[PDB]
Ligand binder design. Structure first.
Ligand SMILES: [Zn+2]
Lengths: 40, 67, 253, 51, 209, 232
């Protein structure tokens, strides 16, 4: 997971989190010359 | 000659490699489910039984039922 | 390394439901002694019997006794596998192994006891397990051990006499097939100063990079000097220094 | 085997510091051969004061 | 078996006393040459369910040139050492403000404990040895030459005489059996005095990294 | 008092917004209005394009997409996608990133599209002649994606239930050699769905495996033999 997705990094004038997007990462696999992404 | 198949085309929705086999060696039963249309079939297996045998039992039940 | 297989002559699995009238006539005379004073709950003895008879040649050749083998069997398995044995002075060296049952298996009056295997097939498994995996004597990974009175002086002990003469001493040295340098080195009566593996990877794991440099230079000198030819010590020392410069065994690959 | 050896030691040499370093200038030996002498000039001898 | 277990406990203690003496802790000749009979007489003879319980063997010893620098040797009774055990030793150390400890584990110790040992590393330096490794003092072996940890004042000199960046010396890894025996940590330098069949003697150095 | 062990453990353990979203939307409106003023002055409209990175980096936060949509992000995006006073299109980067974001912002309800006018703002770019072909494809697919729900259609094939397919399949039903010959798979159209056709040893083996492990001549620190996986 791209941690820290729960927080707005820029305060827009209003210890530090990772500031990620919160998205679950794919596991990438190779098939000869083609790359495939797989989400569990 | 070559390596045995482990993913199959759903005999109903024909979506390729959409069906996978779960083998419950404990209850002696194999379960196949289409990850697309969710169709399922279950058949009694033995220790010799491989995924290709389950898929075949599914095909034999379909071929017998579609008459 | 001496496994139960190494000393075993024959094994047999019998349906012997009552040891007090055992199907094996040779054993009735001595089996009574263990049931006359049972060290185990006789209600738990399985009717299937695994009788193992040991080869006296292979037993005395390595100073083994029935009591030691029974100790090893009881330790490796436990309360669940009772072992009975003949006296070492009898004509035939025999062990009588039986599976001990369990009260937890009695409590399931109607549940499907699928986790329990048939005793006769279980004994055949325990035999195939115990024969090749039951270490009775020795160290694993050591296939065989030769005994030798060194001839090369570098294998003989050399110790200075009070008057200064070097006076090599010939001492029994064991030359193994397979290695386990740390265990062999810690055995009592094994000289820990000189015992060596002739296997540089072992040297790195057991004695470290500098020890590796020394051991590698000696083994390389050994192969290069086998046919009697000579190479100046500079070339060996340089090769071993580069292979150990970075603190690890840098392969020439 | 000979290729492997040369490719592994081709850069090791004696520097003017009389230390033996390599391409990375890592000191391998503080003196060549632990004594700093060339292989052509040394000879076999017997140590009388030994033994 | 009590006779074999007493032999092993005596042999590890003998190796630990030699390790402490070589690391420069203060150990008396009587502790250093103690025989097995004299061990049985002091710590007892029945370790299975009896007198030399491993908590009874702990050594506390003081650096020969600074009596405030002290090292515990702990012999856990637990076959496999866990975080909770290390916590006990860390507390007993903090109470005594002893910064060094050596854990002679019987089986291995848990990856979590192996971590906590390095996690405490800046304030409390505690390190581990399998008892299987202490049955032999590896420095006694004929292959192993004499390692000497160099003090920093003299490594400055070493690097200045040879006009040599510390990165250029031969290396030794801290996990090395003798980097472990002498207890050295990276960036520290080991001097090495080796016999030589062409020079008679050869001194070399190894940076711990 | 705390032990140094607990201080260390606690220290390491210590390692493990709607207002700021609203303020972001406010800043997006301020940026688009300032770009309108700058465009009237015939100056380069840099404010939107200067804020774009900060905005895109936040609209991607999965945990906030609901907050973003419900806070009026669609209205602000409509303002940024809308042409300027001289009826020029926004910076290429703005169209590229906002169209891509909209594809990644699927929770948008019909009332949200109708009220914000984002649909009009994308159909505009889809028709517009100065729009690049890739942006026209993105706008085209967006328009299809957003209009399908209006007509109840859907494009997720994994979204149709099992019974729906079984029923549809019934709705669509009609009225020598010297060597072994490889047979070929059945082409038959399967309509009907078939009824289903429906330890004491491992404890001692684990004990022996443990005895084997216990016998090993292990070391406390795994020495790297050839320099592989060297630490630090
Ligand atoms: Zn991310």
């Amino acid at each position: 997971i791209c941690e820290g997705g729960e927080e707005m990094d820029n305060k827009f004038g209003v210890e530090k989190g990772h500031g990620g997007c919160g998205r679950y990462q794919p596991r990438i696999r190779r098939s000869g010359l083609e790359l495939y992404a797989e989400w569990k | 000659t070559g390596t045995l198949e482990t993913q199959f085309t759903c005999p109903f929705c024909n979506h390729e490699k959409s069906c996978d086999v779960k083998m419950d060696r404990a209850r002696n039963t194999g379960v196949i489910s289409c990850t697309v249309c969710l169709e399922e079939f279950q058949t009694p297996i033995t220790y010799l039984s491989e995924p290709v045998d389950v898929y075949s039992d599914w095909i034999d039940a379909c071929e017998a039922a579609n008459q | 390394h001496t496994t139960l297989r190494k000393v075993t002559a024959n094994t047999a699995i019998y349906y012997d439901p009552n040891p007090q009238s055992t199907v094996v006539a040779e054993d009735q005379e001595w089996v009574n002694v263990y049931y006359e004073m049972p060290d185990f709950d006789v209600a738990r003895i399985s009717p299937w019997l695994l009788r193992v008879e040991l080869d006296r040649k292979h037993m005395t050749d390595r100073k083994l006794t029935m009591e030691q083998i029974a100790e090893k069997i009881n330790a490796g398995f436990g309360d669940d596998l009772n072992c009975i044995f003949n006296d070492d002075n009898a004509e035939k060296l025999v062990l009588r192994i039986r599976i001990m049952n369990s009260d937890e298996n009695k409590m399931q009056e109607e549940e499907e006891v699928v986790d329990k295997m048939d005793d006769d097939v279980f004994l055949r498994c325990i035999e195939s397990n115990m024969l090749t995996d039951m270490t009775l004597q020795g160290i694993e990974q050591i296939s065989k051990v030769y005994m030798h009175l060194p001839q090369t002086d570098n294998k003989k002990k050399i110790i200075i006499t009070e008057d200064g003469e070097f006076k090599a001493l010939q001492e029994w040295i064991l030359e193994t097939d397979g290695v386990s340098l740390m265990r062999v080195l810690s055995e009592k009566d094994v000289d820990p100063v000189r015992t060596t593996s002739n296997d540089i990877v072992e040297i790195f794991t057991v004695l470290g990079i500098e020890a590796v440099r020394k051991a590698l230079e000696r083994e390389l000198y050994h192969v290069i000097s086998f046919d009697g030819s000579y190479v100046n010590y500079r070339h060996l020392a340089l090769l071993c220094d580069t292979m150990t410069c970075r603190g690890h065994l840098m392969a020439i690959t | 085997i000979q290729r492997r050896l040369i490719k592994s030691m081709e850069s090791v040499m004696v520097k003017y510091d009389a230390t033996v370093r390599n391409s990375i200038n890592q000191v391998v030996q503080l003196r060549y051969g632990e004594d700093g002498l060339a292989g052509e000039s040394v000879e076999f001898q017997n140590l009388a004061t030994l033994k | 078996d009590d006779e074999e277990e007493t032999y092993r406990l005596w042999k590890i203690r003998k190796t630990i006393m030699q390790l402490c003496h070589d690391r420069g802790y203060l150990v008396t000749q009587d502790e250093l040459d103690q025989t097995l009979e004299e061990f049985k007489a002091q710590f007892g003879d029945k370790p299975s369910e009896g007198r030399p319980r491993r908590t009874d063997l702990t050594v506390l010893v003081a650096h020969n040139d600074d009596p405030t620098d002290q090292m515990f040797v702990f012999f856990p009774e637990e076959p496999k050492v866990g975080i909770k055990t290390i916590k006990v030793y860390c507390q007993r150390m903090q109470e005594e403000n002893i910064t060094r400890a050596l854990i002679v584990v019987q089986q291995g110790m848990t990856p979590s404990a192996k971590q906590s040992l390095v996690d405490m590393a800046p304030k409390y330096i505690l390190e581990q040895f399998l008892q299987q490794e202490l049955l032999i003092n590896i420095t006694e072996h004929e292959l192993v030459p004499e390692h000497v940890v160099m003090t920093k004042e003299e490594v400055t000199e070493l690097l200045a005489r040879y006009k040599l960046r510390e990165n250029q010396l031969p290396r030794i890894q801290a996990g090395d059996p003798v980097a472990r025996y002498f207890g050295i940590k990276r960036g520290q330098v080991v001097k090495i005095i080796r016999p030589s069949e062409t020079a008679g003697r050869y001194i070399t150095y190894r940076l711990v990294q | 008092f705390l032990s140094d062990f607990e201080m260390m453990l606690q220290r390491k353990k210590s390692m493990s917004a709607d207002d700021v979203v609203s303020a972001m939307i406010v800043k997006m409106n301020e940026a688009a209005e300032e770009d309108r003023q700058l465009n009237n002055q015939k100056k380069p409209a840099l404010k939107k394009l200067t804020l774009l990175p900060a905005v895109v980096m936040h609209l991607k936060k999965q945990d906030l997409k609901e907050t973003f949509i419900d806070s009026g992000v669609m209205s602000a995006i409509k303002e940024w996608l809308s042409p300027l006073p001289d009826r020029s299109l926004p910076a290429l980067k703005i169209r590229e990133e906002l169209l891509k974001i909209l594809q990644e912002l699927p929770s948008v309800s019909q009332e949200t599209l109708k009220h914000s006018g984002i649909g009009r703002a994308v159909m505009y770019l889809y028709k517009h002649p100065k729009e690049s072909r890739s942006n026209k494809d993105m706008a085209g697919k967006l328009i299809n994606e957003w209009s399908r729900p209006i007509f109840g259609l859907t494009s997720n094939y994994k979204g149709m239930t099992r019974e729906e397919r079984e029923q549809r399949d019934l709705e669509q039903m009609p009225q020598f050699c010297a060597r072994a010959r490889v047979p070929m798979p059945s082409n038959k159209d399967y309509v009907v769905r078939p009824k289903w056709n429906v330890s004491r040893l491992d404890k001692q083996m684990r004990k022996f495996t443990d005895i084997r492990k216990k016998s090993r001549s292990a070391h406390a620190v795994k020495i790297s033999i050839e320099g592989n996986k060297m630490p630090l």
